[PDB]
Each structure stands twice: as structure tokens, then as C-alpha cells.
Design a protein around this ligand. Sequence first.
Ligand SMILES: Nc1ncnc2c1ncn2[C@@H]1O[C@H](COP(=O)(O)OP(=O)(O)OP(=O)(O)O)[C@@H](O)[C@H]1O
Ligand SMILES: Nc1ncnc2c1ncn2[C@@H]1O[C@H](COP(=O)(O)OP(=O)(O)OP(=O)(O)O)[C@@H](O)[C@H]1O
Ligand SMILES: [Mg+2]
Ligand SMILES: [Mg+2]
Lengths: 314, 355, 49
Amino acid sequence: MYIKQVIIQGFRSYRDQTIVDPFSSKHNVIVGRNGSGKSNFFYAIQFVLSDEFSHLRPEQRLALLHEGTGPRVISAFVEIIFDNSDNRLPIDKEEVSLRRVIGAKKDQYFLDKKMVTKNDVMNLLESAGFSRSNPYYIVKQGKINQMATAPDSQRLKLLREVIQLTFKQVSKNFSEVFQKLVPGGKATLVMKTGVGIRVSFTGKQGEMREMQQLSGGQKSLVALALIFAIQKCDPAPFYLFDQIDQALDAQHRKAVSDMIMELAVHAQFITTTFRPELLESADKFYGVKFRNKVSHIDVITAEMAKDFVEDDTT
Amino acid sequence: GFLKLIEIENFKSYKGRQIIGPFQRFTAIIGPNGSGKSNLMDAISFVLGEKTSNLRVKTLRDLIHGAPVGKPAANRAFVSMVYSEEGAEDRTFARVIVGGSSEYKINNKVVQLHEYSEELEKLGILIKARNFLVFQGAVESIAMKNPKERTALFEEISRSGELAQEYDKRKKEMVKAKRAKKAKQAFEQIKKERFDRFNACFESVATNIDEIYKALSRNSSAQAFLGPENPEEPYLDGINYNCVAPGKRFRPMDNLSGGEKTVAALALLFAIHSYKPAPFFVLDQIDAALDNTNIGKVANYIKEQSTCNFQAIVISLKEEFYTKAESLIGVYPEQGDCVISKVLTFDLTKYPDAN
Amino acid sequence: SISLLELCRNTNRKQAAAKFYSFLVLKKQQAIELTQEEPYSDIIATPGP
Ligand SMILES: Nc1ncnc2c1ncn2[C@@H]1O[C@H](COP(=O)(O)OP(=O)(O)OP(=O)(O)O)[C@@H](O)[C@H]1O
Ligand SMILES: Nc1ncnc2c1ncn2[C@@H]1O[C@H](COP(=O)(O)OP(=O)(O)OP(=O)(O)O)[C@@H](O)[C@H]1O
Ligand SMILES: [Mg+2]
Ligand SMILES: [Mg+2]
């Protein structure tokens, strides 16, 4: 609901202390270089609020600790403290401390600075709007193009979770947000068992079609349009957009940046982009470096990020 | 070898008598979303006779221009390419779709699929190698194939699959072992033939990929090791693929950073070119997880190896990457009854170098 | 009505490619329509509806 602070200690790229200046209120873009630790930061953010990291064999979990300097780090520390100012969380604490501590065998939680088991967190996160069942609103790197072409069963399940009456107006919200993104588009949800997505763009007359046949860039637009429609109908905690616009053109990048600015007021949208188009719609930027096999996190001013991503820095 | 021109009529999202412009040693294609940019790559892969289900189409009936809208434009559609080498042997390949099926043409003559594939493989370009056609999502997928089928990839590129179907049963007719001895020395011949063919591909690609990736990253620390499991019979199980990044030690490939991982793919994509070099490589937004500080090295490698060894055409969006390309043909859409798409072609080598 | 190369005379590869890409992408919104006949030739800029 409000990503305020993040602390990382030897998770996957930041061996030593990496205390960060607390996040912005609306939007956050994390620019950086290749092999630096942007995704590992996003994976850390969703490491405490997404189930599908700790469900696997202790092999990817074992390699999930920083071993680049030799011996494995005893404590892989990731912490994000929330802000229940709007009383959305069941706990009525203005600054809720939430974190997961993982080591060689440890996988436990600390809540407001006390030890606790994994079993206590699903209820509080689901009551806070966190959808741990599916990787919704936490879109991974390069996955924004699979939500659009997903079969109608998955979309029906998504809308069911988000029940029988909170879909008619979701269709209208999707229509309005999609015409906002694409001036000529006329996509619309259709309810048959399954839900179809009659997508269109630049034709406006009879070009209604089926989702699979769309282009590889229109799919990202459709997927983020559905995400934003679900946001507008029912608020969600926040959004992690790791290279959300690596596939779509700059023309939509400006068209998604301005409208995410128009949407950033209600909820926080932590993102990551290498194109300067999306970073004009934030307040507190970021910069992730990779030196001497120990990455670092440091806030950078707007002109610094603009210079970093405007031209080659080789 | 390099393509000269492709004629497309009534194919996916394409209408009119338009013809694709000339191709050069390193020509890039750029444009907006929904403009049918991969549709050029779709045609280039279609004239090779695919399985017609990875082009976002079904049962090969909706490939017609604007077919999946309820009002198909027509029923007659075709895609044709030309090919040539040093000698001006302007061969021509073509495919036509009619009714619920398709026909194949070579130099404007109906040719069966057997002879079509036979003529294709004569240039070193295979029918199901899958080794130079990469899609939007394949770039991060071509770096992390399941090794169980990367072994199949190396086996089929090595011109060795034609005996695989007669390989395995040999083993099951050794277990029954007078006749047994002469069966025993009548078994290892195919074993060692497939063995040294697979190696002739394997150690060649492995000993060239390290230098390729070093040239790609221009760093001595970075390297790529390609080793099988059960080296005595390397072509049975998966072909383990690993790479050591400039800033990272030996680590599993599947958890590599998206920046280097694609580079690894490119290295591998530019390593299997060592054995049976394919005539041309098409890249469909390899610039997915690549930064401006790393697309430069890949672009420089493509420039130095695109006028000496092979040819490459790239789909890209990042301004830096397609700047280096000699030509910058583009694709743009247009309103109409359907979503019209057509190609606009310019040149850059006439213009002065970037300052 | 407005040509391309004569305004692209004194420019490097980077800026020329950038402005060509801009010219090609601005047509997606039917702002300016372009017609080509020879594969490597200039096209005048005629604004669309
Ligand atoms: N079966 C079809 N028949 C006709 N037109 C189609 C068909 N399927 C899609 N189209 C149209 O053509 C486009 C397909 O474009 P394509 O898949 O080649 O993407 P692209 O231009 O490479 O995009 P990007 O690289 O931005 O993702 C769709 O946006 C649609 O307008
Ligand atoms: N389990 C791990 N332990 C330690 N370091 C790792 C681990 N997995 C990946 N790394 C390294 O962490 C660094 C950061 O990679 P990261 O995950 O941030 O990349 P990405 O965000 O996908 O890609 P890019 O930053 O190039 O766009 C890389 O050098 C990578 O090799
Ligand atoms: Mg595409
Ligand atoms: Mg990344």
C-alpha cells in the first residue's frame, strides 16, 4: 500500500549494508547497468510478498544467497516497512515493520521486530489487497506479453478473485483506460465459462479480433490496460513494473508514462526502465551500481538518470 | 549469400503489390507497435515451411490479410524470396496458400516439399534447425533451452539425425547376445560414426564460442564453456551450457542476469554458426534486456562479423543498436478495411558516420 | 510536400536515424501520410486527416 523503506543485506548482489533513502510517495524508477542488481532488488521486494520463491527445493534457495565473495552470507536480509495511514492493513500501526530473514536453513518472518512463522502472513497480506495466489501487479521481466494472450480461464479466475458483480464496471474501466492508452483503440471485455477481449486499434469500425492474433507489442498494452482497469475498479497495494516497456514503442511509452502519472496519485508504482520515456513520471529515482563484486544502491537526481539513459555511457 | 528482395501479396497484415526493399550485409528493421514488424520475419520464416502454429495463427487458414475479422480480403496469397551468392545465381523460393493448403515454388515451378527441403539444405540452411530464426520471446529462451533438447539441436545441426531412428533399436538387439559376437562388432560402427560427427560439431562450437563471447564482451574474464554429460556418449542427455560473466564467477546459467543472458544466447547463436554456417541470421528484438552500455559491444561485433562471415538482419527498438546498421528499412501501418501494413526503405551508409 | 534528405544533409548517423524513426512513427497516428515508389528514394511529407 505504501513502500516506504527497503533494507538489503547480502541477498543476491549487495553483500554489505545497503540502507536506502526511503521511497517516494507516487512513483519510483530504478535505472542501472547490466549485471547490477535491478531485478534482484525487485525480486527482493516480492521475496516477502510473493509465495513462489520459497516453494522450491533448497537449491535455488541455497544459490539465492550471496556467495560471490566466497563463503555464503549467514543472513540474507530483506526488509520493507509499510504505512497504514489509510488503515487498509488490519494492523492499525502507522509504520508496520515487515521482513523475511533467510539463511542457510532459515526462512522466517519478522513482524514489527518480532520473530514469527510463515503461517501468519497470508491472511494479513490478502486482507491488505496483496494477491499472493498469482503474480498479478508484480509483473516480471519480459512477462508483460503473456497476460494478454492467456486463455480465458486465467482471466476468468483473475476477475473472480477480484465477484459476480465486480466485472460489468471492470469492463467499462478497461474500455476507458484502453481508449486513454490508444486514442483509436476500441477494445472491450466480452462475457461468454470464459471472458474474451475484443481488441482493436486504429480501425474503429469492424476490426474486433481475438487476443492471440495481436502483435507482440499490443499484448503489453492490453495486459497493462487490464491491470490498470483492475486498479481503477478496486485499489491494489502497489505495482512492480520491471522493464514494463522494453517491448513497446516510445510512442506508447509517453502514453503510459503520462497516464501512470495520472494514476500514480492513488497508489505507488515502483518501476524499472532503461528508456528515458518512463522516468519522467516519478519523483525519487534510483541508481544501482556493480563494483568489486558487491553492488550498491544510491539515489540519483533526475538529471543524473537522464544523462545515464539518454546516451551510451561507454 | 544474402537476400535481395521478397514479394508479399495478401499475407498476414499485408495488402498490395508491394515488394520488400534490398537487403545489405547488416540491415535493421524498425517501426511502431502493431505495425507488422515481425510479419517480415514471419514471411522469412514462412518461406522455409514451418509448422504454421507459432505465428499467432491457427490451422493455416487465417494467414490471409485480415482473415480473423470476419471479412477476409481474398483467398490468393503468396510470399516469395530471392537468394544469391558470389556468382549472381539468383535463385527464387516461394510459397502460395490456397484453399486449406499450400504449394511450393522454386524459380516459378511447382515443387514438392521433399525437393523444396532438399534444395534448401543445399545452402547450409536447414528446415527444422530453428538455429537462426528468433522471435520476440525466443531471445531469452534461446539462451536457456532445456538441455535435453539442446542436445537434439546439436544432433540435428550436425547432420546426424537421419541415423538416430535406426540407432536405439541396435542397443536393444545387443542385449539378446555364435551370432552374438558378429552382432557385437556390427554395432559400434554407427556408434562411432554418430560419435565423431557429434564431436566434430561439439568441440568445434565449444572451442570457437569462448573467443566469440570474449569478442562480444571484449573482456578476458568473460568466457563460455559448453560441456555435455556422460562425455563417452555426449549426444544422449542434455548439453550443459555455462558462462562466466565479467563480474561474476562460475554460476548456473538459469539465474544469470537478463543483460548477460541474452548476450550468452547471442554468443551461442553466433557459435553454432561455426559448424555449418547458416546463410543469414534474423534477430527479433534481442534488445530486450540489453542496456546502451552493452548493445554497443554486440553492435560492434555484428558490424565486424557481418561483412566477413555472414549476414544479419535485426529487429530493434533502441536507437543506438539500429544506428550502427548499414541500412534501416522500416515498416509502418495504415488505416483501411483491415490493419494495413507496408514497408518503407531508406539507407544510412550514404550518410556520414555518427560523431 | 516536404522532402527528407535536403534537411538531413548536415547530420550524423545517430540523429538521421532518430529523425527517420520519428518520421516513420508519426504516421501511425495518421498525422502525415507518405508514399514511396522506388525502394531507396526520398518521400515528401504530406499531412494526413
Ligand atoms: N492474422 C492476421 N491477419 C491480418 N492482420 C493481422 C493478423 N494478426 C495480426 N494482424 C495485424 O498485424 C499486427 C501484427 O504485427 P506483428 O505481430 O508483426 O508485430 P510487430 O509489428 O513486430 O510489433 P512489435 O515489435 O511492436 O511487438 C497486429 O497488430 C494486427 O494489427
Ligand atoms: N543467485 C545469485 N547470487 C548472486 N549473484 C547473482 C545471482 N543471480 C544472479 N546474480 C548476479 O546478479 C547481477 C545482477 O543481475 P540482475 O538479476 O539484476 O539482472 P537483470 O535485472 O535481469 O538484468 P539487467 O540489469 O542486465 O537488465 C548479475 O551480475 C547476476 O549474474
Ligand atoms: Mg513485434
Ligand atoms: Mg535486467
